[PDB]
Symmetry: D2
Subunit: 392 residues, 4 copies
């Protein structure tokens, strides 16, 4: 009922319950005590029989979880030490040897490495499918298919999946659909509202917004999230989020809407500019009318995002020269920071892939990815302009 910005500030917290504290106190405590051992045993017996209690759990983490659940429109949330923590805790819970996971064609490097060199080496079967192509996806479904996992838009080429289409297919086989919603955040896209079962985030990125914490979030139905908490997190990863970092993340979430509006406004201008430049061969930005999945993008995303990928005609050398000339944009991995960032993976940083896997899946050569920050657009334009000139 209250609006997104209202919920991002207030959801799950009334100051009058914590001595009037306007900002909730930070529970930086590894443990909680009991009034009797009988009461203590009841807390662990509940958890031992699959029930999450909110007594032997941290109220700072609980509040972050409830708030993220509200923003994504899910039943329950789980906070973890990183995006990789969210992903691995989720998949280790849901998969066992002989199960199959159907994967988007393009994934974040460490997700790819986890799948191919981690869980995939313990007898879990993997298959990559184009998640926009529903007839290909339907034909890839097998009785072993238990999870469908993808990012949308897909890092780093912005390929989109048809989330409602995927969910419709999955539902015929009872398969669980997991969407990495890092790029969009719940402010731009809510995959659970389109039929996904679970969403994962690297909250290290836009949710934090300020580049100072590492964190992960899972949001979904109570039964799935409980199992990921009690098995994935507790037993299989130990990817515990610091209450300090959780509190900072909640601080970032309070400006999520305002930050995302600005990331998007800035990236729209840079995309319009780059699409016209002679040095630029191709560009991937969902807000351009020429984006191949323009219509699908606008069905799922309320705004076209803060990320741009493009390719320079001069290939790898031009890519390098462009990167090296940047003075305001920083040369770095990561995204979703106040500071604008750039990376040119042909100076390898989707490096978990071999050269042939990068070619087979959608990762190129003159390809530069920009995380457009919150700086004054006129300064960002000037920096991109002179770097483009230097790329000759």
């Amino acid at each position: 009922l209250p609006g997104f910005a209202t919920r991002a500030i207030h959801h799950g917290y009334d100051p009058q319950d914590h001595g009037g504290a306007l900002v909730p106190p930070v529970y930086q405590t590894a443990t909680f005590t009991f009034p009797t051992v009988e009461y203590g045993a009841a807390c662990f017996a509940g958890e031992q029989a699959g029930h999450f209690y909110s007594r032997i759990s941290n109220p700072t983490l609980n509040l972050l979880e409830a708030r993220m659940a509200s923003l994504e429109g899910g039943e329950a949330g789980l906070a973890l030490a990183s995006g990789m923590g969210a992903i691995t805790s989720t998949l280790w819970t849901l998969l066992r040897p002989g199960d199959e996971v159907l994967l988007g064609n393009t994934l974040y490097g460490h997700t790819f490495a986890f799948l191919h060199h981690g869980i995939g080496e313990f007898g879990v079967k993997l298959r990559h499918v184009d998640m926009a192509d529903l007839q290909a996806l339907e034909a890839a479904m097998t009785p072993a298919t238990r999870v469908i996992y993808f990012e949308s838009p897909a890092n780093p080429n912005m390929h989109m999946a048809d989330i409602a289409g995927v969910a419709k297919i999955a539902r015929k086989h009872g398969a669980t659909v997991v969407v990495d919603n890092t790029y969009c955040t719940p402010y731009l896209q809510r995959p659970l509202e389109l039929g996904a079962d679970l969403v994962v985030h690297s909250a290290t990125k836009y949710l934090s917004g300020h580049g100072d914490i590492t964190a992960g979030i899972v949001v979904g139905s109570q039964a799935l999230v409980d199992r990921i908490r009690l098995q994935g997190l507790k037993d299989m990863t130990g990817a515990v989020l610091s209450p300090h970092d959780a509190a900072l993340l909640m601080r970032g979430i309070k400006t999520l809407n305002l930050r995302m509006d600005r990331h998007c406004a800035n990236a729209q201008v840079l995309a319009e500019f780059l699409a016209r430049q002679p040095q630029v061969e191709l560009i991937h930005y969902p807000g351009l009318a020429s984006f191949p999945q323009y219509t699908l993008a606008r069905q799922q995303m309320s705004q076209p995002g803060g990320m741009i990928a493009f390719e320079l005609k001069g290939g790898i050398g031009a890519g390098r020269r462009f990167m090296n000339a940047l003075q305001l944009f920083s040369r770095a991995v990561s995204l979703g920071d106040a500071e604008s960032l750039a990376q040119h993976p042909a100076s390898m940083t989707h490096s978990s892939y071999t050269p042939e896997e990068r070619a087979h899946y959608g990762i190129s050569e003159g390809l530069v990815r920009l995380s457009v920050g919150l700086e004054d657009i006129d300064d960002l334009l000037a920096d991109v302009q002179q770097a483009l000139k230097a790329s000759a």
Copy 2:
């Protein structure tokens, strides 16, 4: 001369850090940053292409975590350290790296509840074979070694009954057959016991406990060879768990480590007095404290541990019934899990820390009904004695 190793307390405070290299900051600055930037695109391919081949020295490693790691490595006498989000982070990152389907892991008979659950309901369900062996019985361990045995994993002393393994004995068997020995050294810390110096390959900690000392962070540490720690960093942590430690918490952990020697001295002094007191009170059936000659592995404890630790496991006459009345009358001790806190704690393993085990598994792996576990804290021993004294009275 200058080739003398600085003492433990000196290293816990100074190792790896010279204020001169950070503008004279006496306390190292906290690198609370998710990412690091590059001067050129080429310095950057060099870090990531380099990380992929096998090596860790991505100079985009977090200096706060790196100092913590180097300091823990120095204290344990290992080549390299890795900092993680929790003790379970350290354990799972290690075992996910070292084991694949068809490998066998030999396990100590008694394990921390979530370690047991990880093994039996986690990695053991992905094709890794498990077998439990009494790691104090070297003949039984030898007999259990198979060509598929890849890892030997145990705690010493074990949570919660304080059963000991002969670490050098285990390591000798592991050298003959080829297995990697991993020791959970949480209870002792490097101040009391250094398994790597006894021939273990890797040590893991829940740094949440004594290393922190103050119960305000959750954290894990792995120490061992450069080769094994790099592998665990680059696969286990980076790909299989994501159990990343906050630089804020790493800095708090380092702060705690600066008083580790002084705190452990007081934990052990207090526990020795309390254990001697408890052994003489009418209501106590048995007491297991490594510092008493009644301790079943007294001489092994004396040999491996420089002091007998801060943990007491005991059992009242009255069984579990009296255990609950005793624990309920405590007024200074808190009823809580965890250990290695400044605050004294009392818990009941069978319904709390080892709730992950079934009842028959608890009977099978040496976890009794009636066991009361004390984590003896840093309070005035006369106050702790008075508290235990009055609670004993109320349990009668």
Copy 3:
């Protein structure tokens, strides 16, 4: 010259100087060591001579100071433990027995109390003057007049001072002009560009933006700020800011432009709404055409701000009924949080005044002050609407 948002994010820091750290590391250290004692002696010799040096000062604090100096367009900045730390350190440095200070007619309660019950009881003369009346100000000048101090807009009438007019007069008589710029922030108003010598802030408010730190800032000339640092702060108050809180304040400043845009947009809608309602006797909001100093406010402020003050018909009883009915606004003092706040200033934030002095210095009974937060405006409209119905 880079834009405001760019400078709020980047000014004074290049990652390449701190091992590539994108976010500057937090120097949570009470002290710094010297390579030699001659080097150490030289540092202390510098500050005895009156000069400030970067070594033997904290880099986290120094960055915050440099960044605030850039945003206000001043030479030098100083960070302190609170707004009152900024104000007291400043006035303790600049005044001595027999000096006079001319004050705006209405001040923040603790500033008032400091002046009247603190430094004023140590032989410093005070006189209150309307700082929008240049002839009254000119008339009140004496050879002893050393400092002119005021807030603009002043709480909670929002009375504006003519900063450039006041400064012209001050330059003639050789007085130092100090402006408490808490309400506007450098994003809306830069009193140094209008001729002020020093600006002070409660950075606890909008600069932080998230209600989790207490902090103060002074900005002005190098010569003045050095004296305030070396005498007021080091000797007379000891109001030292934690590097942890300074880092959080910098995190807040990174979204200042975005947050102030939203605070202002929301406040405008509520002010316009309040003006059309029958329960409202009178409303003080700079952005309404009917505001008495509308033109002077537009000349000094780029936007009309996030603070609204107003009187209900029904006086104090209606005020109580309104406040006690609020369900989304919180009853609290403070301002400039993400959370919307409401208060009654006579019994709370100006409780340092006696009943004669509340009436003496334009502080009404029946006045309600709103700090309009960042929540969805439709939610804020709904809460104000239902609370007005409950006021009747």
Copy 4:
């Protein structure tokens, strides 16, 4: 009464009142909200009547204050941003023009500068007396003597005052006794139990113990502490302590007894070593039988402390060479850290004095001060031994 160590860990906190949190949550919030306005006005009515309330007060700071009060044996505590914050807030409250303050002959440099160049330029009269000479103190007393202020032992020569003897004189004449107890901590010396009215600390030093926060503490009667809070802190300094730093200080306090035991044990060995070395002319350590006030040290301090002062035969030249040679000790001001520190008081901590004021007030040009840390004593002896060789 539970033991010191017990109280340092537990006093004032029951986990059961905060959902079983074993560590108290950190209230990192600038403000607190109200359930009604008349509730809010009751709190600020209370503060105008001189009464301190728990609501609109920070529970983290309150716990620190209660704990510090317990350890000193006092009724009430106050936490501030620095030791100078404690000192200034106290003296600004207690003194007015015409009042006389009697001072120990040797004070910390910024305390000296605050007195002579700050409050002493606002009409407060100052006189220095030897607080060990009770005849001379008695003879210096006047009816205008409002405050007697000293450190014991004094920074930096270790000269002591007989606190109970001074207190007797103060009671006869009607003066308030303020003792800076920074060097000893409550673990070694409790001036309130010897008749002092107030104690102040730089909690930056031993209480923190780890060199990572800046903080001050005042302890004394509820009557005095309330006045210092409501005037000195609220109005005259704004020296507000961060809840983050308060929480860290409480963390430090939990090991105070263990750290001080080690500091003192190391310092005794080092002092005994220094006493036998040919390069050393004189040493000031309370634990040596040769200390002029050995008997009074043993009466009044339970251990001789972690601080050593000594003079090298070769004067300032040898002092410099000694300092520059140290490899394990750091050259730094500050004290009470885990890390061992060394400095030259005349050019550093007492550089606010002129050359002639140092000569007059017992601050030699040749003095070296050591803050003996927690490192292995054999390592510290080796470093000192080589630096003594190098001093020639």
